[PDB]
Amino acid sequence: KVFGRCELAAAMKRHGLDNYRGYSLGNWVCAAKFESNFNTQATNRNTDGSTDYGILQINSRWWCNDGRTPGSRNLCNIPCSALLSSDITASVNCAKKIVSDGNGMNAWVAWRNRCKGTDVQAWIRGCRL
C-alpha cells in the first residue's frame, strides 16, 4: 500500500506514534517519506546481507526475521514480511522499540540526513488531525 501523506499521519497518530519518545508526528511522517516514499511494500538489501522492510525500512539484522540474515536477532519477534502489510501496526510497534533503544530516531539514516533539524511540522500541515 502507498499511503497518502495525511492518511499515514492519521494512522500513525491512532497507533500512538505522535510524540512517542518525544518525537512529534511530523518526524515520523518525514522519516517514512524518505525511507519508503510511503510504500509499505518497500524493501532494500544492504551490503551486509540484511534487508530493510516496510514504511520505516526496518532492518533484519536486529529487528525482524527474514530467514536469510545469518547471525541476526529478531528483537521485534516478527517475520520481516509483517512489516510489509497494508496495516502498519507491526511497523509501528517495532519502531517504538527501535526508537527506545538509545539513539532515538538516529536509527533511521534517512531521518538523520533528511528530517532531523528541518521543519518537520510541514509534513502534517493541512491534515485533519
Footprint on residues 76-115 left by ligand WE4 (CB under 6 A): 76, 78, 89-90, 93-94, 97
What residues contact residue 46 under an 8 Å CB cut-off, 6+ apart? 52, 59
Site string for ligand WE4, 19-58 (x = CB under 6 A): ----------------------------------------
Of 5 and 96, nearer to ligand WE4 (C-beta) is 96
7 labelled catalytic:
no
| Catalytic position from the list 7, 35, 66, 119 | 35
Decide if 101 contacts 95 (C-beta within 8 A): no
Of 24 and 93, nearer to ligand WE4 (C-beta) is 93
Kindly state whether residue 11 participates in binding ligand WE4, applying the rule CB under 6 A. no
SS3 94: helix
Residue 85 C-beta: closest distance to ligand WE4, Å: 10
- Residue 59's closest CA among 43, 39, 38? 43
| 101 belongs to an annotated ligand binding site | yes
Tell me the one-letter amino acid at 127. Answer: C
Gap between the Cα atoms of 75 and 64, Å rounded: 6
Residue 126 C-beta: closest distance to ligand WE4, Å: 29
Tell me the one-letter amino acid at 104. Answer: G
Tell me the one-letter amino acid at 53. Answer: Y
52 labelled catalytic:
yes
* CA 97 to centroid of chain Cα atoms: 11
Active site residues: 35, 52
Which residues are near ligand WE4 by CB under 6 A? 76, 78, 89-90, 93-94, 97
